[PDB]
From Swiss-Prot, chain A:
Job description of the protein: Attaches the virion to the cell membrane by interacting with host receptor, initiating the infection. The major receptor is host ACE2. When S2/S2' has been cleaved, binding to the receptor triggers direct fusion at the cell membrane. When S2/S2' has not been cleaved, binding to the receptor results in internalization of the virus by endocytosis using host TFRC and GRM2 and leading to fusion of the virion membrane with the host endosomal membrane. Alternatively, may use NRP1/NRP2 and integrin as entry receptors.
Disulfide feature: 21-46
Chain segments carrying region Disordered: 4-20
Protein name: Spike protein S1
Outcome reported for the amino acid change (mutating residue 28 to Q): Reduced viral infectivity
Lineage, opening ranks: Viruses, Riboviria, Orthornavirae, Pisuviricota, Pisoniviricetes
Glycosylation sites: 16, 28
Subunit structure: Binds to host ACE2. RBD also interacts with the N-linked glycan on 'Asn-90' of ACE2. Cleavage of S generates a polybasic C-terminal sequence on S1 that binds to host Neuropilin-1 (NRP1) and Neuropilin-2 (NRP2) receptors. Interacts with host integrin alpha-5/beta-1 (ITGA5:ITGB1) and with ACE2 in complex with integrin alpha-5/beta-1 (ITGA5:ITGB1). May interact via cytoplasmic c-terminus with M protein. May interact (via N-terminus) with host bilirubin and biliverdin, thereby preventing antibody binding to the SARS-CoV-2 spike NTD via an allosteric mechanism.
Residues of the full protein shown: 316 to 363 of 1273
């Protein structure tokens, strides 16, 4: 079997986009949609 | 007919080929590597089997 090798180092690699997502704006809009007319928005190129 | 017999007057030497299996491929399974890959977390659950 194998008990020889166990990982110890961790290689974490992510796209280097650093712009934080606009949640503070999306959530704090002065008004939201009426549920019958709910609105869909793309969230992209950001860190959630 | 109750009173006649056929006798061979000649013969043929024949060579015939009989093919027989005797072994199969020896196989081995690392049951941990097959089930869990390398993931430590799954290997801990596999111990519970
Ligand atoms: C069995 O038959 C074979 C032929 O099928 C005989 O062999 C032949 O014999 C004659 C006379 O001796 C030759 O002219 C041929 O050339 C032979 N042919 C071959 C292929 O060998 C054979 O003699 C027979 N056996 C007996 C015991 O009579
Ligand atoms: C929402 O935005 C307005 C204007 O930027 C600000 O005055 C208010 O405090 C914000 N509310 C929250 C909960 O972030």
């Amino acid at each position: 079997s194998n008990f020889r090798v166990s990982p110890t180092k961790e290689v974490v690699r992510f796209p280097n986009i650093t712009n934080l997502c606009p949640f503070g704006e999306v959530f704090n809009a002065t008004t939201f949609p009426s549920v019958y007319a709910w609105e869909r928005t793309r969230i992209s190129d950001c860190v959630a | 007919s109750n009173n006649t017999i056929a006798i061979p007057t000649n013969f043929s030497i024949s060579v015939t080929t009989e093919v027989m299996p005797v072994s199969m491929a020896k196989t081995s399974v690392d049951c941990t590597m097959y089930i869990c890959g390398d993931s430590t977390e799954c290997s801990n659950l596999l111990l519970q089997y």
